C-alpha cells in the first residue's frame, strides 16, 4: 500500500487525528454503563461515569461523523481495567472514567467495552481508513494511601486478574516511596509520586517485564498507535528500553506526553525527541498558538520563531503531535471569544508540520475551564458547523499533498498580525496565509512562492473570507487584500521525478527489524536503501513503491545512521538523518557511582563501549546522571537502556560544557541481564 494508507502504523504525519474521552463521546451501549454514585447518564456531573463507550465510537465511525470530517485517525482513553473505587477529594465524588487510574494493563475497562468490543472498534476503524491511537500511562496505578490502605484500591497491580502487590506493604518495592513531586526538578517529577498517584519502579524487573508484555497485547489487538502518559515523569533511559520493545516486535507511532507551559522552550524535551524512540505532544507549538490566536500575548513574530526553532530544535518536527487544546488546560473556545479565532488555530494546525490532534468537540466550539469543564458530553454531532466544515476541507490535504505532510516550512510574508507560510516537498507546494487581525484587512503586496505561474483558488472556497492568488513569474504575486480574520490556503500537486524521502519510522531499532520509508519518486522497481555508507538492495528491500518503500535494518554495528535511497536509475534522494540502529535487544539498567564530587554547573555523565552508551564519546555521553532522589550526592545514579546480554565497559565522567574529566583507573566491566533489569553499583576511580 502507498504512504497514505490505513496500514501504514509508522507514519501518521499524512493523517488528522480525534481526540477522544471514551465516556464523554457516545455510549453505544448502556448495558455496560456503571451504575449508582459511580454514574449520571445526564453528564451533567462531569466527575462520574457518564457511558460513553467503545461501541459509541463505533457507532460514529460507522455513521460518517468522523469520515465526513476528514478524520483519519482516532486517539482513545487508556483501555485498560480501572480501578472502581469512587474517590471521594473534598465532599468531591470521582471515578475512572478519564481511564488514567489503572489497575489491570492487561485486561479492559468493562465501562468502555470487552476485548472483543475492542477487536470490534479496530476493525471497524480500519475498514474506514481509520486508524487507532491508544493512550497508554505506565508511569503509575491509581491513588493509594501510603498511610491507609483501605482508600481507593492501595494503587493495586493486578497482572491478568493476579494481585502483584498494592501500595502498603509494598516488600516487593513495585513501586517509588520517595514522597510526592512538586515539580521542581525534573528528577523530582521523575522518582517521586505524581499527586497520590502510586508510582511505579521500573528498576523493578517484575514491574518492567510485566509492561513490556503487556503493551504487546495491545499491539497484538491491532493498534496503530500509542500516546503515552507523563513521559516526563518516568525514567528516559526505561523508556527508551520500553520504546526499544516496541520497535523490535511491532512498531507503531509512539508520542509522550511532556508538558510545556506558555513561553517554555526545554532542550531535555528536544532530546527526549530526538533519543527516546518516541515523538511528542507538540506543546511548543500548542502554546504559542493559543497565545498568538487566542490569548493575544504574542504576535505572528513569535509564531514564526516557534515554527523556526522548532524545526531546528526537533530532529523530526514532522513527527510532533500538534494541537490547540486538550483535557488538561481550557476549551481553546471562549465562551464569549470570536469564534474565527478557534477556525483560524484549527486551519493553521491542519496545515503546518508534524501531526494534527483535534480534541473532541472542538468542532462543536465546546468551552469548558480546567478539569473536569473541558471534558462535558459532545453536545452535538452536526456537520455544519464552519470549524467542522474547516477541518473537512484541510485534513484531506494531508494525503493528497505531500507539501503539507513531509514540506519544510518558509515564512514568505510576515507583520505583527499577518503570516503567510509555504509548505515545499518535491513537486508539491501550500501556501498558508492568516490574518489573526479580526478588525483590519491587511495590503498583501511583495508575496513571493514557489507556485507555479497561474490564479489559485482558496482551497477553503473564501469559507474563512479568504481569496483567489494570483502568481507570475518567478512565483511573485499580485498584490491582494488579506480580509480580516482571513484565511486562506493554495496549492500545487504533481508528480515528483526524483526521490525524496518525506518520512521515517520506527527511528529506532535493531538490525532485521523493517522500517518503512515514505516519501515520493522512488519508483515502481526496486532501488537501493543506505544506511551510511551500508548499501542494502534486493530481498531486504520486502517491498518498494512509488511512495513506500519496506525494508530491514542491515546488521551494522550500533550507531546513528543517514538514511538515504536511489531509485533503480541510480538517482540518489536527500537524506533523512538520525537513525538510531540498536545494539541488539536493549534492557534498562540503573548504574550508580560513588564519590563522585562535582562543583556546581559541573555534572557526572556515563560513557561506555557500546553505542548504547555512545561508544567512549564524551559528546555522547549519558547523563547528566542524579544524585537527590534514589540517591544523593556524591553519589550519582541514572537508568540507561543497554544492550541485553552483553559484557560492556563503562566509565564515567565530569563534565563541565564540553570540558571532560575522565575516571581514572581501568574500565568498569558488567554483563547486561538477558531480560529485566539490574543495578551496576561501582566507586568512582580517581
Ligand atoms: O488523578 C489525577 C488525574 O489523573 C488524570 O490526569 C492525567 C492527565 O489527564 C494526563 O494527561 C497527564 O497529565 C499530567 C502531566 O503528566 C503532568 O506533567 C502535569 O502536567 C502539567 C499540568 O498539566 C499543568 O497544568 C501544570 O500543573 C500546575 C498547575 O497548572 C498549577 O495550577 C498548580 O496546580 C495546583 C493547583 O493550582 C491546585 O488547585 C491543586 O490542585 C488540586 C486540584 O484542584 C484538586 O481538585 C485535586 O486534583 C485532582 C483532580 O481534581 C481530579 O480530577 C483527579 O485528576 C485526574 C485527572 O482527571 C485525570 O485525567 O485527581 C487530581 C489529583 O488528585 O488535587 C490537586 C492537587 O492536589 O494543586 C495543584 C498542584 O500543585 O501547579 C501545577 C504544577 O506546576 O504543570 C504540569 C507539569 O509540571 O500534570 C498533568 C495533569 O495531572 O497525567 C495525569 C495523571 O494520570
Ligand atoms: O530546584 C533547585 C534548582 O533546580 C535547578 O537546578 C539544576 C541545575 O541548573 C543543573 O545544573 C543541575 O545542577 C546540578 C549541578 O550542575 C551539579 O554540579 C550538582 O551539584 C552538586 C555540586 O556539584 C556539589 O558540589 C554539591 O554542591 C554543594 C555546593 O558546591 C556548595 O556550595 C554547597 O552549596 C550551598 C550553596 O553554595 C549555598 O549558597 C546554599 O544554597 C542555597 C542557594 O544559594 C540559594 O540560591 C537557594 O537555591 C535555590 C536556587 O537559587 C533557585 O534558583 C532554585 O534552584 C533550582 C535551579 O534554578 C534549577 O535550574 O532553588 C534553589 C533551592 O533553594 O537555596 C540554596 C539552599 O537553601 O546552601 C548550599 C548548601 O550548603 O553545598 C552543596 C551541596 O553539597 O552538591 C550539588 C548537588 O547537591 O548537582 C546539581 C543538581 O543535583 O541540576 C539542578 C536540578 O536538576
Ligand atoms: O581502539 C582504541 C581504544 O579504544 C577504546 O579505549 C577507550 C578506553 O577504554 C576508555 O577507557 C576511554 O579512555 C579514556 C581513559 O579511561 C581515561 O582515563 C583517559 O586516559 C588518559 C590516561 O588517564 C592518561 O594517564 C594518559 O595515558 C598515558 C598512559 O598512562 C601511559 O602509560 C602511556 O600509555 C602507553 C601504555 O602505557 C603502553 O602500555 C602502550 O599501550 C599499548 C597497550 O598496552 C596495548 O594493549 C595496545 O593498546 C591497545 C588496546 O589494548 C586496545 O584494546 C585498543 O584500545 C581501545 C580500547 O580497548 C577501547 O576501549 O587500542 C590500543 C592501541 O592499539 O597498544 C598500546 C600501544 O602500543 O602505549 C601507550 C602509549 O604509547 O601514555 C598515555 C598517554 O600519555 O592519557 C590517556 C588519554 O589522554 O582518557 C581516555 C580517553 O582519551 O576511552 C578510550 C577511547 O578513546
Ligand atoms: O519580497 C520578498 C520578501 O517577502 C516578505 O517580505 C514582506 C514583509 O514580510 C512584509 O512585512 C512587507 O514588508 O512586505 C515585504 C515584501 O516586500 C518576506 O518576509 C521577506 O523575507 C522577503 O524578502
Ligand atoms: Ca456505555
Ligand atoms: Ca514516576
Ligand atoms: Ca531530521
Redesign the pocket.
Known amino acids: 500500500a502507498p504512504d497514505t494508507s490505513v496500514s501504514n502504523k509508522q507514519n501518521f504525519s499524512t493523517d488528522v487525528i480525534y481526540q477522544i474521552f471514551t465516556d464523554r463521546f457516545s455510549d453505544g451501549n448502556p448495558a455496560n454503563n456503571p451504575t449508582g454514585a459511580a454514574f449520571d447518564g445526564t453528564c451533567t456531573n462531569l466527575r462520574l461515569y457518564c457511558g460513553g463507550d467503545w461501541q459509541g465510537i463505533i457507532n460514529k465511525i460507522n455513521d460518517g461523523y468522523l469520515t465526513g470530517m476528514g478524520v483519519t485517525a482516532i486517539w482513545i482513553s487508556q483501555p485498560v481495567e480501572n480501578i472502581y473505587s469512587i474517590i471521594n477529594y473534598s465532599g468531591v465524588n470521582n471515578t475512572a472514567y478519564h481511564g488514567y487510574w489503572a489497575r489491570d494493563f492487561k485486561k479492559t475497562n468493562p465501562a468502555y467495552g470487552t476485548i472483543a468490543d475492542f477487536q470490534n472498534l479496530i476493525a471497524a476503524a480500519h475498514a474506514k481508513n481509520i486508524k487507532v491511537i491508544i493512550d497508554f500511562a505506565p508511569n503509575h496505578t491509581s491513588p493509594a494511601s501510603s498511610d491507609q490502605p483501605s482508600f481507593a484500591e492501595n494503587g493495586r497491580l493486578y497482572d491478568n486478574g493476579t494481585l502483584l502487590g498494592g501500595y502498603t506493604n509494598d516488600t516487593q518495592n513495585l513501586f517509588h516511596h520517595n514522597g510526592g513531586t512538586d515539580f ?5 517529577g521523575i522518582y517521586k509520586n505524581l499527586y497520590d498517584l502510586a508510582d511505579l519502579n521500573h528498576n523493578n524487573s517484575t514491574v518492567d517485564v510485566y509492561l513490556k508484555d503487556a503493551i504487546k497485547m495491545w499491539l497484538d489487538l491491532g493498534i496503530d498507535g500509542i500516546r503515552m502518559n507523563a513521559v516526563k515523569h518516568m525514567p528516559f533511559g526505561w523508556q527508551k528500553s520500553f520504546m526499544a520493545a516496541v520497535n523490535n516486535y511491532k512498531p507503531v507511532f509512539t508520542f509522550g506526553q511532556w508538558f510545556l507551559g506558555v513561553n517554555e522552550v526545554s532542550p531535555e524535551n528536544h532530546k527526549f525527541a530526538n533519543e527516546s524512540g518516541m515523538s511528542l505532544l507538540d506543546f511548543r507549538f500548542a502554546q504559542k498558538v493559543r497565545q498568538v490566536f487566542r490569548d493575544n500575548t504574542d504576535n505572528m513574530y513569535g509564531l514564526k520563531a516557534m515554527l523556526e526553532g522548532s524545526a531546528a530544535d526537533y530532529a523530526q518536527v514532522d513527527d510532533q503531535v500538534t494541537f490547540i487544546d486538550n483535557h488538561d488546560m481550557e476549551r481553546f473556545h471562549a465562551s464569549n471569544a470570536n469564534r474565527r479565532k478557534l477556525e483560524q488555530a484549527l486551519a493553521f494546525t491542519l496545515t503546518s508540520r508534524g501531526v494534527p490532534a483535534i480534541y473532541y468537540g472542538t468542532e462543536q466550539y465546546m468551552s469548558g475551564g480546567t478539569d473536569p469543564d473541558n471534558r462535558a458530553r459532545i453536545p452535538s454531532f452536526s456537520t455544519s458547523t464552519t470549524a467542522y466544515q474547516v477541518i473537512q476541507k484541510l485534513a484531506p490535504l494531508r494525503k493528497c499533498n505531500p507539501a503539507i505532510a513531509y514540506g519544510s516550512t518558509q515564512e514568505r510574508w510576515i507583520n505583527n498580525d499577518v503570516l503567510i507560510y509555504e509548505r515545499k516537498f518535491g513537486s508539491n507546494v501550500a501556501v498558508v496565509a492568516v490574518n489573526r487581525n479580526l478588525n483590519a484587512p491587511a495590503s498583501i503586496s511583495g508575496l513571493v512562492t514557489s507556485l507555479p505561474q497561474g490564479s489559485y483558488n482558496d482551497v477553503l472556497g473564501g469559507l474563512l473570507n479568504g481569496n483567489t492568488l494570483s502568481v507570475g513569474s518567478g512565483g511573485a504575486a499580485s498584490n491582494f487584500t488579506l480580509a480580516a480574520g482571513g484565511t486562506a490556503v493554495w496549492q500545487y500537486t504533481a508528480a515528483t521525478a526524483t526521490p525524496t524521502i518525506g518520512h521515517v519510522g520506527p527511528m529506532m531499532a535493531k538490525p532485521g527489524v523493517t522500517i518503512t520509508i515514505d516519501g515520493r519518486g522512488f519508483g515502481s522497481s526496486k532501488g537501493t536503501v543506505y544506511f551510511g555508507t551500508t548499501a542494502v538492495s534486493g530481498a531486504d528491500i520486502t517491498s518498494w513503491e512509488d511512495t513506500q518503500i519496506k525494508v530491514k535494518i542491515p546488521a551494522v554495528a550500533g550507531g546513528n545512521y543517514n538514511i538515504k535511497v536511489a531509485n533503480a536509475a541510480g538517482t540518489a534522494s536527500n537524506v533523512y538523518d538520525n537513525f538510531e540502529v540498536l545494539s541488539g535487544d536493549q534492557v534498562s539498567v540503573r548504574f550508580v557511582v560513588n564519590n563522585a ?7 557526572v555523565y556515563l560513557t561506555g563501549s557500546v553505542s548504547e552508551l555512545g561508544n567512549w564519546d564524551p559528546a555522547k555521553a549519558i547523563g ?1 546522571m ?3 532522589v534514589v540517591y ?3 553519589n550519582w545514579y541514572y537508568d540507561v537502556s543497554v544492550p541485553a546480554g552483553k559484557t560492556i565497559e563503562f566509565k564515567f565522567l565530569k563534565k563541565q560544557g564540553s570540558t571532560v574529566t575522565w575516571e581514572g583507573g581501568s574500565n568498569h566491566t558488567f554483563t547486561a541481564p538477558s531480560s529485566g533489569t539490574a543495578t551496576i553499583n561501582v566507586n568512582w576511580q580517581p
Open positions: 521542581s526538578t525534573t528528577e523530582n564530587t562535582t562543583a556546581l554547573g559541573q555534572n547528566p542524579y544524585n537527590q544523593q550526592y556524591p
